[PDB]
Every structure is written in C-alpha cells, then in structure tokens.
Amino acid sequence: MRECISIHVGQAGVQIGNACWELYCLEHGIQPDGQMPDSFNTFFSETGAGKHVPRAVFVDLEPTVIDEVRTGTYRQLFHPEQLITGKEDAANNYARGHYTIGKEIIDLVLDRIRKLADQCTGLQGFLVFHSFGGGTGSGFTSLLMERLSVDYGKKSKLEFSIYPAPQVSTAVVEPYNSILTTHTTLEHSDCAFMVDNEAIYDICRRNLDIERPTYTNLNRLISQIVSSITASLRFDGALNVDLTEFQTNLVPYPRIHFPLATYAPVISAEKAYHEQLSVAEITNACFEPANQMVKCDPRHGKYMACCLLYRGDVVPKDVNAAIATIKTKRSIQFVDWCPTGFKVGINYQPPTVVPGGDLAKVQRAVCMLSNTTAIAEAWARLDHKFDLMYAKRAFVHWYVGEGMEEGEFSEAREDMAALEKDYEEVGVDSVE
Amino acid sequence: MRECISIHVGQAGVQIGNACWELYCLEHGIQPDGQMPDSFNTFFSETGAGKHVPRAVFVDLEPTVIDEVRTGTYRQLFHPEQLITGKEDAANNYARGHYTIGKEIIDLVLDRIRKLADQCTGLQGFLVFHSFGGGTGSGFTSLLMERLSVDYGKKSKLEFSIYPAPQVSTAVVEPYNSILTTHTTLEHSDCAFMVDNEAIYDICRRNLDIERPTYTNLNRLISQIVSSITASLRFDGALNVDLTEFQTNLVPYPRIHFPLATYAPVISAEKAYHEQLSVAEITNACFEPANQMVKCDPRHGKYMACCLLYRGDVVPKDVNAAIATIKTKRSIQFVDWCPTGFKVGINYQPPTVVPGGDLAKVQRAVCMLSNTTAIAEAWARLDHKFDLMYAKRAFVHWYVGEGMEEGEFSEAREDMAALEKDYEEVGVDSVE
Amino acid sequence: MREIVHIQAGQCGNQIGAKFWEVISDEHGIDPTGSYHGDSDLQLERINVYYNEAAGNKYVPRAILVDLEPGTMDSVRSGPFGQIFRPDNFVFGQSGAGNNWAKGHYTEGAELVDSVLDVVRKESESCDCLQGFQLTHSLGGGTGSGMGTLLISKIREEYPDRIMNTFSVVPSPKVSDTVVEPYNATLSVHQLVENTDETYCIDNEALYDICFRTLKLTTPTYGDLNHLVSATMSGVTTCLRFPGQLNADLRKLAVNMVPFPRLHFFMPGFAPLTSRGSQQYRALTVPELTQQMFDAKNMMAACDPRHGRYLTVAAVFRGRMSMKEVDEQMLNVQNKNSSYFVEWIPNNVKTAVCDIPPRGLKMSATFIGNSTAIQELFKRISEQFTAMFRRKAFLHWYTGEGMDEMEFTEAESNMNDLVSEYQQYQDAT
Amino acid sequence: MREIVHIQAGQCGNQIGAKFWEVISDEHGIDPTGSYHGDSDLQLERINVYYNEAAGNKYVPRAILVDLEPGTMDSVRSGPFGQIFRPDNFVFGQSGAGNNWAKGHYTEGAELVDSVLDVVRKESESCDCLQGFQLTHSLGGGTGSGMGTLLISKIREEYPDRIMNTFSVVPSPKVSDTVVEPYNATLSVHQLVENTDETYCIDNEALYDICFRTLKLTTPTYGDLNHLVSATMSGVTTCLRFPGQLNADLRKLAVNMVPFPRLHFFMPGFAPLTSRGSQQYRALTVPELTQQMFDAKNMMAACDPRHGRYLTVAAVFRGRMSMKEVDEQMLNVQNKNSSYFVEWIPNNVKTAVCDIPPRGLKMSATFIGNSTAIQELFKRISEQFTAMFRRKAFLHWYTGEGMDEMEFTEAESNMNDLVSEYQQYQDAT
Numbered sequence A, B: 001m002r003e004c005i006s007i008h009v010g011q012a013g014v015q016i017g018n019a020c021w022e023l024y025c026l027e028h029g030i031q032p033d034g035q036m037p038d039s040f041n042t043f044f045s046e047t048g049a050g051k052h053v054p055r056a057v058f059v060d061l062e063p064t065v066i067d068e069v070r071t072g073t074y075r076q077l078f079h080p081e082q083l084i085t086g087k088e089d090a091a092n093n094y095a096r097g098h099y100t101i102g103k104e105i106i107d108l109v110l111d112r113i114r115k116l117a118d119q120c121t122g123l124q125g126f127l128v129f130h131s132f133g134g135g136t137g138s139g140f141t142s143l144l145m146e147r148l149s150v151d152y153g154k155k156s157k158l159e160f161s162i163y164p165a166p167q168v169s170t171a172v173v174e175p176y177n178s179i180l181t182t183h184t185t186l187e188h189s190d191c192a193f194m195v196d197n198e199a200i201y202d203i204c205r206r207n208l209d210i211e212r213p214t215y216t217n218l219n220r221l222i223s224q225i226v227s228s229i230t231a232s233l234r235f236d237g238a239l240n241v242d243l244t245e246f247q248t249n250l251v252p253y254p255r256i257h258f259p260l261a262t263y264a265p266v267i268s269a270e271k272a273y274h275e276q277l278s279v280a281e282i283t284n285a286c287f288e289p290a291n292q293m294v295k296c297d298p299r300h301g302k303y304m305a306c307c308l309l310y311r312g313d314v315v316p317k318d319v320n321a322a323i324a325t326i327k328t329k330r331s332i333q334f335v336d337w338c339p340t341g342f343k344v345g346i347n348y349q350p351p352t353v354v355p356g357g358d359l360a361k362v363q364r365a366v367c368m369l370s371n372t373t374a375i376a377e378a379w380a381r382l383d384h385k386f387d388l389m390y391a392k393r394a395f396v397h398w399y400v401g402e403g404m405e406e407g408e409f410s411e412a413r414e415d416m417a418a419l420e421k422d423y424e425e426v427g428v429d430s431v432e
Numbered sequence C, D: 001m002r003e004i005v006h007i008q009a010g011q012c013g014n015q016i017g018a019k020f021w022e023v024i025s026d027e028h029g030i031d032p033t034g035s036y037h038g039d040s041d042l043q044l045e046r047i048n049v050y051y052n053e054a055a056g057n058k059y060v061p062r063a064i065l066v067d068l069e070p071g072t073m074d075s076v077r078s079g080p081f082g083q084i085f086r087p088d089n090f091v092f093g094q095s096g097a098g099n100n101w102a103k104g105h106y107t108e109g110a111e112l113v114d115s116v117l118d119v120v121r122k123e124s125e126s127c128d129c130l131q132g133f134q135l136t137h138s139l140g141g142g143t144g145s146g147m148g149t150l151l152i153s154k155i156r157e158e159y160p161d162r163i164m165n166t167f168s169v170v171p172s173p174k175v176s177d178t179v180v181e182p183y184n185a186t187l188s189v190h191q192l193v194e195n196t197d198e199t200y201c202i203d204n205e206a207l208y209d210i211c212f213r214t215l216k217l218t219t220p221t222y223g224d225l226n227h228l229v230s231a232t233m234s235g236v237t238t239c240l241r242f243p244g245q246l247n248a249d250l251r252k253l254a255v256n257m258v259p260f261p262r263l264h265f266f267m268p269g270f271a272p273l274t275s276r277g278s279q280q281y282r283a284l285t286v287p288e289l290t291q292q293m294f295d296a297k298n299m300m301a302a303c304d305p306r307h308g309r310y311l312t313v314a315a316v317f318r319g320r321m322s323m324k325e326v327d328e329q330m331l332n333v334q335n336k337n338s339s340y341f342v343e344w345i346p347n348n349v350k351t352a353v354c355d356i357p358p359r360g361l362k363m364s365a366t367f368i369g370n371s372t373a374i375q376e377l378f379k380r381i382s383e384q385f386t387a388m389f390r391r392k393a394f395l396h397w398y399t400g401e402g403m404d405e406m407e408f409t410e411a412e413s414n415m416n417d418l419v420s421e422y423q424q425y426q427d428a429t
C-alpha cells in the first residue's frame, strides 16, 4: 500500500542503486529474475504471474553505467523502460545537466515516473540518489526536482547525496556543481542525507579491517543505512517512524534540512566474537565522532535533532536507558531551544547481510539521522573553494558556453552566504 | 504475639545469623523450605499456607556473604526482600560504614524494617548481630541504631557485639572501629552482650576437646546463648523472663550497659556420660572464669548483676540452693549497693542439639548474663591501643578521606575516658 | 443494559486496545473466534456492556479501530484475537499524520473523521442505554492527538449527556520520544480540558520503573506495559460488569473524583504487582494491597503525590473480602498521612468492592487518584513548549497545514491557567 | 560486582601479564577460546571481576596490552591464549623507547597515550562498579616505566576514587640489566609515590634464588619466574573472587597495610614452595606455611626484613583450614619476633581466609609485608643515580627529548625524602 519510488541519477546514484536493489532482493527473498518460491510490495510491483519489478527509475546521460545493468546479473529484474540513457554525458558541467543535455530527457523521465506513480495506491514519496559533484548528479537532479515539485508537490522527497570531501577531491569543478545544485534544489527538497566518501573509507579501514576498500563496499554500507530508514515501512515494528515523520522531526527551519547519517555496528567476522553489542553500547558508538559518515566534528557543533532507528533484537526500555545516559554526556550539546531531541524507531527485523559481504551479521543495528550545526563548517569550506576559483573566473567560460548566465553564479553564492548566516543564527542560545 | 525482629549486619552478623536461624528451625520443626509437617510465631511470620518466614533482615555492604545465604541450604527459608546488599564493602573503615557507603542503603533497610514491624501486634524489640571491628559492623550499625532510636525509641534494642581479643586480632585498625562505634552507639543502645573469639576458641579446645575449632563452631556456640535468651518467649516455662526485663535487671546506670554471656554445660559425648550434670554443678561451672566468653577475669573485678536463665529438667528449689552457696563463695564478690544480684529464669524446654554439632545432648543448661567491673580492663586496653596509633595519626587519612573530622577522634577518646572513670567510681564501696 | 463504546486511535491506542480486548474476552470466557467457552453464568450475565451478540452464538467487541496508517491495523488483524473484531469497524487511512497534530485534526484526520463518526453513531443506535465512550491513545503523535481530539469534539457534541473518558499516554520527563511531542500534547490537552469527563494519565516512564523495580523484569517488553494498562482499564468497569457488595460505575466514579469540572486528570494505579520469586513470601490480603496502593513507586504517572496533595482518591477492590477491613484500611491511611490529603474535602477516600476477582488471583485493587502533583507534568510541558515556540522551531510544519500562531498561544494560555487553578486548590485551607 | 581492569606495559609487563591471564583462565575453568568448560558454579559466580561476557558463551579478559614496539605484542598474539584477548585492546606503537624514560613519558608514549586512554575509558564504562586498576610493568626500561607512569597519572586524574595498584619489576642490586636503569627507576618512583595506592616490589634476583635454592630448579626460565608473580597476583584477588570465611579485598588490604600515604611499597611473598621430590617429605599445614612465609629467602624483594621492621603484614590463606590455628600462629610470630615489628602499631598482622584453594594444592598462603627494610633499595638507587648524575653521564639522551636537570634534581630530592621518612618510622619508639 505504502509505495516508495526510487530514482537513481548518474554513476553514483546508479551504482548505489545496484547495491540497494541487490540488498532488497535478499531481504524479501526475490531472485535476480524477479521471482520468489507481502511486505516487498512497497518496493516491488507485481506483474502477471510470480514476477516482481522494482518501483524504480535509473537515469544517466551516457549509456555505459546503465549498460552494465542491462547486460548484468539483474538484467531480468528491471523492465527496460525503467533504465533510461541518453547519448552524451554532462561532462562535470551543471549547465549541461540542468539545461543543454538534461532538457532533452526530462520529459521522458517524468513520463515514466507518472506511469510508475499511477500504479501506486498509497504513494509515500520519492527517494532520489545522486551526487553533488557530477554534471548529471548536480544539474539534472535540480531540474528533476523542479519538475517533481510541479507534478506532485506535497509528497515527501528525500535526497541521499554524496557531499564532496575536504581533502579527497575528484574533479576540479566539484565546488561549482555543489554550490549551484544546492542553490537550485533548496526550495524543492524536504530533507537531504549527506554522506562523505573519506569518512566511509576511514570506517572501512579502522572498523572493518579492510586494507583496500572499493566503491562497492561503500555502496554496500550505504545500502544498509537506506534499508534501516525504510524497514519501518517494509516490515512490522513495535514503534514505527515513516518517511513523512522524519521531515517533521528533523527540520526546525525549511532551509536547515541536512541531517547526517550514521550506522552501527560495522564490524568484521573476527571482531564479532570478542565484543558484546548492547543497545546502549551501539548507541554510544553511533554518537561518537569517529564512526560518522561525514568528515565533520560534532564536538565543535550543536545537535538540533536526532532520529534513532533501531532494528532486530531490541527492547524499548533499553533504548530509553541508553538515550538517558547520552543526554547526560557533556561532549554532546543540544541547542537550547530544543528540550526534546530524539525521535526513536524500533523494528523487529535484524539487518540482513549480503552473501560474501564485508560486514558481520549482528542481532542489533541502528541508523541515526542527526541534524547538526557542524554542517556549517562544510558550507564555509565549499564557499571558500568557490571564491578562490571564481575570483579568477576559472572554468567559467564553459558554463556560460552551455547557456548559463554569470549573474546566476553570484546569485548562487549569495544564497549560500545567507544559508551560512542562517545556521550561525540558529546556533546561538536563547536570550532571557 | 510478642514478636522479635532480628537484624544481622556484616560478615560476623550474617554468619552468626545463619547458625541462629538454622537452630531456630530445628527447635520449632521448620524445614529449610519454611514448611512443617504456635510458639514459633515470635520469630517466624506465616505466609499463604504451610510456610514460615523469619522475622529477620540481613545486611552487608558487599554481596559475597549474603550471596552464600541466597545460594545455600536455607535459600527458600528467607524472603528475598529481607536480604540487602550494596556493591562495595566498608573496607574496615567506620567512616565508610557510617557515612560514604552506609548512606546508600540505610533508608532501604529501615523501610523494610518498618514493613516487618507493621505486621507485628506485640513487637518486643530487636536483636542486632554485628562486630565492633569491621567497617560495616561498626559504622553501619551505629548509623542504624541512631535511626532506630529516633523512629521507634522506647521499643527495646539488644546487641550481640563481637569484642576483639587482647592478644589475637584480625585488623590493624580494629581499635579505631571499636572505639568510634562504642562512642556513637552508647547513648542509643539499652544493653550490649559482649562475646570474644579467643575465649570461645579456648572453651572449644579445653571443654569440647576440639584441636582445630572453626568459626562455624563459635557461631553455633553463640546461637545456643541466643536461644536461651529467647526460649522464655518461644516456649512455656515455670518462671519467665522477657527482653524488657533483662535491661531493667542487668543495667544499674545508663552508660554501664555491657554484661557478659556464659553458657554451660559445654561438653562432648566422650565426656558427657562420665558426669551427671546437676544444677549446682553447672551453675558453678558457669560462675568460674574458664567457661566465660570474654578474655577478662571477674576475680579481679566485682559482680553488679547476674541473670541466670535455666532450661530443661530444672527444679526451682534446687536453683535457689545452688545460688545460695554461690553467694557464700569467696571468689564471687558483689558491689556493696546490691544486696540481691540474681534474676533467675527457668524454662521447661531442654536445649535441643544441632545434628552434626560439637555439643552433647543434655537434660539441662544455663545461660548467664552477668555484669562486671572487670570489663573496665578491656576498655582500658582498647583506649591504650587507640592512643598508641593516634599519637602518630596512623591510618587517620583513610577516615578523614571519607568525610570524618579529626576532632571527632579526640571526642570519641575523651568519651571513653569518661566511661572508664565511671566504671572505676562504680567499683568503690559506699562511704558510711 | 449499560453499553460502552470502545475506541482505539493510532499505533499505541490500537496495541493497548488489543491487549485490553484479549484480557476482557479471557475474563468473560470468550476465545479468539468469539465463541463462549466459559464456566459460570456470571460471565455471560453482563456480556452486553462490551460485546454485541451476533448470530450462531458468537460475541463481537463494541470496538472501533482507527488509524491514518494501515500497518498496525494489519498487524492487529493478523494477531491472536485479531479475528474477533468486526471487519467493518476497522477504519484506516493510507497517508499517516507524520507526528503532526495539524494533520490529525485538520487535514488527513478531517477527511477520515466522518467515516468513523458514521460507524460510531450506528453503534450508539444499536445499544439500548449507552453509558458512554472510552478513547485509548497517546497525546504525543499526530493521529491519537489531533484525530483523537477531533473525535472527542464531535462525539461530545452528538452525545453531551453520555460520559467521555480517555486513557491517554502522556509524554515522559527523561526521554523525549519525539521532537514535536510537546506541541502535540499541549494542543491535545487544550481540547481535553474542555471536552472530556475524565482523563487517565498513563506515563511510560513510570511503567518502566514499575516493571523494572517492582515486577523485577530486567527486560520489559511493550506488551507487558500494555498488559498493566489493560488491567487497570478492566478494574474501572469490573463493578459495572459483575455482582458486588458496594457497586461503582463510570458516572459515580466521575462524580466522586471530580470536584471541579476542569480538574479531571487521574493518576491510575494497580495492586498487587509482584515478582515470581517474591509472590509466595507475602500474603496477598487487603492490608498488603492497601500498603502497595498508596505510594509513589507504584503510580503510573511521572509525579510524586508527596509533592502535592490528593484532592480525591477512589479505590476499587475485587475478590471475596471483609468490607469492614477495607474501610478500616482506608481510614488508617487518611489518618496517618493527613497532610497529603487536602483538608476541605472530608473523608476524601471512596470505595468500591466487586466480588469477582481477576483471573489467577484471590484479590486485587485498582486506584484512581486526583492529585495536585500532576500540575508538575503540565508545567514541564508548558516550559518545553515555550522554549521551542519562542524561536518558532518546527512551526512551518503546522502553519503549512493552515494553523496560526494564535491557536498555539491560546493553547499555552489555557494550560497555564489550569496549572494556576491546580496550585490554588493545592494551597487552599 | 567489583570489576578490575588489567593493564600491561612493555615487554616484561606483557609477558608477566599473559602468564597471569593463563593462570586465571585455568582457575575459572576457561579454555584458550574463552568458553567455560569447568565444573563448579563458584568458577562463574564472580567471573565478571576479570572477564567481560561476550555474545554466545565467550569470556574475554578486561585486559589492555600496551607497548611502544610491536614484537612482544605479536608474540603474545601467537602465544598460547593469545586468541582470548579483544584484538582492539592491543594498543602498540611503531617506534620503541630505546630504554629511555623520556621517550616513554614525554615523546613516543605521549603519541600513543590517548589511544590507550580511550580504550580504558570504554572498559571502565563497561563495568557496573569498577574496583580499580592493576598495572604490570618494569621500572628499569622506557615504556613500562615512562609510559606506564604517564598512564597512571592520567587514570588517577580520570578516576581518583578507584584504587590503583602496581606490580613493579625493580632493578636488582647485584646485576644491572640496563645501563640507565637507575635514572628510569628514580623517575618512575617520583610518579609512583604520588599516584599509586599500593606498589608490589618484585626483584628477579629474589626470584632466581627462590627457584634455584627452594624450588630446586637447576635451570629456571623467565616463564617459571613469572609464574611466581602470577601466583602472588591471583592470591591477592582470591578473597574478592571466591567465597570465604573472612573476606579481604583491595581496599581493606590498603587500609590495613598503609599507615601513611607514601609508605605503600610492599614486599610480596608466597607459600608453599616445593620440588617434585621434596614435597612428599613434609606435610603442608598452617604452621609450616607460616614458617615458610616469615623469612628472607622467601621474599620476592632482595631486602632482608631483619634489617628493618615490619609496619604491617597481611596474610591471605586459601584452602580449608582452621581459623583458630591460623590466629594462634599469627600471634606466635608476633610474640617471638617482637623486635622485627614496629612497637606503635599493635596487632600489626591482618588475616584473610578464602575457602577455594589454588589448583593442585590443598592449601596456600600469600604474604604482603610493608617493611622499613625496602628503604635499602631506595638508598641504593639514590647512590647509583648520584654516581652517574654528578658527572652528567648519558644526560644528553634525556635532555635531547626535552627534559631538564631541574626535573631530575627534584625527583632525586623526593626519593631521598621518602627514605628519610622510612628511616624515621623504623627508628621511632
């Protein structure tokens, strides 16, 4: 009944999607051909005779990444019309994504979404997977959001976005893409879950004992977090928190819609036996800065809201106890205008693990979504990066050549300045 | 109707309690599960149907000693809520017992006592079992007594307190503990029955022919004396004495409330049947220094008051005769202000013997509670011990660290000096 | 003869409700299919208060199940006892309320309320002599809080002369279960003060304490908590459902427990709650029950009665026992703890006694206390509300649904006034 | 119930520690995997004192292994019982200390200390009621000495109310192991005097003597030597870990044995000590054990108790034995050897008995003597320090790491003051 439509944009979005749909299949006992020898139904539609199809769209502006899906292990899982490719990519250029190349497929993408949505009886909303840095992930995504807002409007929209790192850069133009897409998508997105590749790599090396983590591993990890978010919809639970609830809980002001995601426990096979894993113990692990999936320091920020989603062999009293002790903890400060900081979800189903996966199978897990003033730092960094290049007009000609106007750059920048100030203002404590 | 509540504090108190409740059960035919296939009622309450529960509280600041009771033979005999334990012991430190650690459970202990007391229709008062030397037995007990005095007051309080031996000892700081607890408890207790391990060991070796007596044996011996004290309440007798009466008889001045206990005959089956144990014979045995349970010499002091509690096959005339001859006896000198020095109790029930016990089964026994100026010696010794260590401030930092103040030491010492002088004054005969 | 209409709203409301139903059917000897397999004619005599008799010797709860979400409903349906309910009495939406009072009261809830109301009216019209309505829900979510208040408003308007009572799970001191719970509770309270006859304040924190400390459950489950609540609920209707010596019902209790209309917030209690090891050592007789009932540790509201005064107290005893003894016990507590009872209501302890004990037991006791200490809870909520509202935190979630700041403000004001009222009577001589 | 945290610093610390752990495992019926395969319920009753219970019937030492170099750690990991430890509880550096206190305390150690501390804190928080910490280390090296002292300082700062005890491997008078060991010891002692609650002094010279002369071992190995230490350690905690008649613990011992804060340096001792042949020709009884305990050849510190006075002596007996007899023996030794006991502390002997004997034995005894004779060692150290420092030999190795002469000087002064204090109490009447 409570359908969820997933949209995977560009390489990051598609590859993450691969990992997510792989996991979903394992969790619901769906084979790679769509068959199984009732809960699945929020993510899989049902056709004809014992075949089940993901409620998803995969889009990329070049064919290579999606071609892998078509030719791969899960070729029979997706219907061909839900795998959409253009001919030429956005070449790390927001303008090409948003205008020049994106405007050629946007109608198509939306048409297919409409068809998907027409077979839903109780649409909860959308999960949009992309990156900040790519021309498609940045430019196309903003365009897509705009259209979605027009055709649906009041349906919860969620973005799992690979926020660029401080040190671990990939392209040179990442800051431009990040800034523009944030500016253009801001008024159209309800909640966005930031993730940082550096942090996940670190986690993999320290907590999973993995010498050389691959993008695959990162994707797998992300899939777990996503699964925890939607488990309350896909399974039965003692206390349930849904997609709408998150936005209500975690967003105190419309602009401040960027909670950070944390998962626990992420351990190896050897480290499963020598460690007990109570609810308090994993919650504490989550709430400690070293296990965070964005390269930021909460000790230097303030918490505005926490949502804790527990899963498996979990007891509500125990969670309450755990939270109580965390409340006392001096190193965790919450904003002074918020006496109530926790939304808590508890679900019966343990996290299911992919055969041959890097994570050990545990009786209890937890996914925290927490909104923090520490994000301000990242924004400041990004703005600084933008300023350095823009002062010289470095790369600007490309954007203008693809139909962007220079004034829009300055506009994006000023909007981000305003955003930065908004965070700062929120930070300070109540007078009188 | 005439209920008596027993409180067992610390290792000594608890272990002795084990021996006492074992004995009571055998005496009343109560099995280790609380069942029996009306006299019991002063010591046991009755619950549901065919179950009898001790009117008792066991307290220690560490779990180990009480855990033995919980896991032991009489696990089902005691109600779980009457077994009270903390986490950390008082570490032979009065301060920890009275303040730092004791303040954590005192309220709880008292609350349970109140519940016990509310189920009594004719509460006589209390039996308190503890030691002078331990941090719990000294510090906790003093605290507890203070509270009792406030919340009940005129209801009687009786103490079986384990005095440290002259030559033998257990702790280094025993003198400190002994002195402080005596000081703090003095004005709050009505009567305190001293018993000394060295003396009992000697008795065991000489009279019972035991090469190597265990604490168990000592405890058993103590349990006999306690039974004799309570037999007047638990059975019918010719001439009866109840707990209030003792204090009136034994204590001539408020501060001089330290009698001593002596039990006889203590013999083995090897040496029981080459005797016939007449009243005169056992009385004489009792009144000789070799059978005493305090390492003190009455020959060097004076008697102030005796209470003799006879039990079993006894004839009042015979008792009178026995006492008369003891009155004449040169080795028994009584204070000048006391023309009549014996309260006599006579009970029909013989002392029944514990299966596997060291004592032989006899037709009669006697328990003397006798009050003597000879105890002054012990006090003098203890004072001397205190002064030796205090002159150097040895160990003092421990006590101060737990919130005790130096001035309180000197206060305790001076109070004891006064006590010593009081005994001396009492000793001398009246002018004209 | 004396029909009650039962309503369950939201996840909490429905989970507690199911347990309650299970308890009640067990009491009356009804199995999961609705058939009577009991032993005494006493179990059927007053069946009609909670069950309608259908064709072929089956019994069906006079129960309405309501939620904006379909999952919990489905779970209930799939549970043991799920099949006892009338399928047409499940009224569920598709959207949910997203923990938003506005959505529950004005938007999603608004679009569903008429459908509920239609069923409710039908149920009322079936019944010969409607006693009234009991609503089970939380104040902290969106449906229980917003939708629940709406339901209360409408039902009250329709049936102003029938009794409207609620079993409300109130947000707790230590943990925050949600972020916007203060808003949801505050709004709810404003309606409840105007439109209910009596409100039973159940707090999960207190329940946890009871389970861990008194029941000696190291690892309580929500089910266990729900069970306690259900037992308490059962306690309140026992005198209406069975023969007794001194017989109470819902109206009489209200009359005794409510000296002024606005002050109708009860702290409920249940005795005897005991551990498995600890059961055989204590004798469960009236004195024990009495001792259990009148203390802070056994109250299901997060407030110490010793921080205020008891305005009125109703004790409802079940089992074969001496009335005289009961009365003596009641007298004793009043006399000895004189300072904890407000002195301008003489003999402020009311008694009811029903001969039928709960299952497995020889006797039990259920407690309803109206204490001025509950004001502390309200104050906490007010403070929390203010802290957030002064910075307009989360406000656009509610204003987006058509709500204005004025409504919030008024709600706050009303809450404050109630607290002041409570204080005044606490202090009065 | 009274959890102890175990810490191992440097090569010696880790080698001793491993052996100790092995000994404990055997005692509590724990195999190399961490599973319980014992028989008596007493083995698991107080298992939580040294072990954390992991998921699926495993038990893991509450142990931290710390070293500035990885070789010893590696060996431990590959050793018998290496797999029982939590992998995350091995915290090792890459550099090494080069037998330099400076490097351990200020440089390399400084770089590693936070990682240790983090683990330690976690371990502490695991425990319901932390009794305290035991540190196993040498004074003569760089890591155990410098890093260990630093760790102690931090732990004390964090948890000043929990007791810190140390099993300290001290430099022998006859044969110096390493060239700068006087400096390393002296510095270490400066920290230890202010930051530890009790310090067990062990010298390998004593151990060797015991092994050759008493145990009749022609060719002792370091493992064998370490076994003695392990036995002492286990003996010290036996009253905390098992039921007994008179139950000592770490606090009680400290109270009995430390009359003045700084004077907490013990000479540990153990009995019985018997060869394979020589055991059968003499019966193990209490008096014999006592006799074995009270002489110079059986002390684990190379100092003659006949050259000083005992301030305090604690004896802890394990096995079924008669209290009376024990007491008599204790009295007897005091009486007959009056001149070796300080006159201003009457009853200077503390007695404890635990009913659970060590494995293979019917009875045993562990001895803790606080003797003014330990001053000899300190004097020797001072002398050796002086001999080097007056010529500033090796000084640039320490000053090169940021240390200054002033620090050294103050350390020396402190040590001398302690010696003086010891002398004063030795000579007091």
Ligand SMILES: Nc1nc2c(ncn2[C@@H]2O[C@H](COP(=O)(O)OP(=O)(O)OP(=O)(O)O)[C@@H](O)[C@H]2O)c(=O)[nH]1
Pocket (backbone or CB within 6 Å): A009, A010, A011, A012, A013, A015, A016, A061, A089, A090, A091, A092, A093, A130, A131, A132, A133, A134, A135, A136, A137, A138, A162, A164, A170, A197, A215, A216, A218, A219
């Ligand atoms: N977490 C994660 N990040 C990825 C993955 N692949 C790429 N990225 C990140 O995505 C950003 C690059 O954007 P892409 O998604 O490759 O670019 P695109 O969306 O295909 O856009 P164009 O190629 O410019 O059309 C960088 O920050 C990469 O680190 C992946 O599998 N997992």
Ligand SMILES: Nc1nc2c(ncn2[C@@H]2O[C@H](COP(=O)(O)OP(=O)(O)OP(=O)(O)O)[C@@H](O)[C@H]2O)c(=O)[nH]1
Pocket (backbone or CB within 6 Å): B009, B010, B011, B012, B013, B015, B016, B060, B061, B089, B090, B091, B092, B093, B131, B133, B134, B135, B136, B137, B138, B162, B164, B170, B197, B215, B216, B218, B219, D245, D246, D247
């Ligand atoms: N007669 C007898 N004396 C005992 C027994 N157990 C301990 N003692 C004596 O009691 C004194 C020691 O005090 P304990 O009761 O062990 O100490 P505690 O009350 O547990 O206090 P802490 O352990 O310091 O908290 C010594 O004089 C022991 O000889 C026993 O079973 N019988």
Ligand SMILES: Nc1nc2c(ncn2[C@@H]2O[C@H](COP(=O)(O)OP(=O)(O)OP(O)(O)=S)[C@@H](O)[C@H]2O)c(=O)[nH]1
Pocket (backbone or CB within 6 Å): A238, A239, A245, C009, C010, C011, C012, C013, C015, C016, C068, C069, C096, C097, C098, C099, C100, C104, C138, C139, C140, C141, C142, C143, C144, C145, C169, C170, C171, C172, C177, C178, C204, C222, C225, C226
């Ligand atoms: N006793 C009990 N309390 C619950 C349960 N579930 C939630 N609560 C309590 O109820 C409050 C939120 O309840 P919830 O069940 O989410 O209300 P809801 O109205 O169903 O939520 P919604 O449908 O509007 S989103 C919290 O204070 C929480 O502690 C339950 O199963 N039992």
Ligand SMILES: Nc1nc2c(ncn2[C@@H]2O[C@H](COP(=O)(O)OP(=O)(O)OP(O)(O)=S)[C@@H](O)[C@H]2O)c(=O)[nH]1
Pocket (backbone or CB within 6 Å): D009, D010, D011, D012, D013, D015, D016, D068, D069, D096, D097, D098, D099, D100, D138, D139, D140, D141, D142, D143, D144, D145, D169, D170, D171, D172, D177, D178, D204, D222, D223, D225, D226
């Ligand atoms: N009892 C015992 N003593 C040892 C052992 N190994 C070394 N020692 C003693 O410890 C001292 C030196 O130990 P060492 O291991 O060098 O300390 P360290 O801190 O690890 O040395 P470093 O890393 O700074 S160079 C010497 O006095 C030596 O006699 C052992 O296995 N058992």
Ligand SMILES: [Mg+2]
Pocket (backbone or CB within 6 Å): A010, A011, A062, A089, A134, A136
């Ligand atoms: Mg690409």
Ligand SMILES: [Mg+2]
Pocket (backbone or CB within 6 Å): B010, B011, B062, B089, B134, B136, D247
């Ligand atoms: Mg003790």
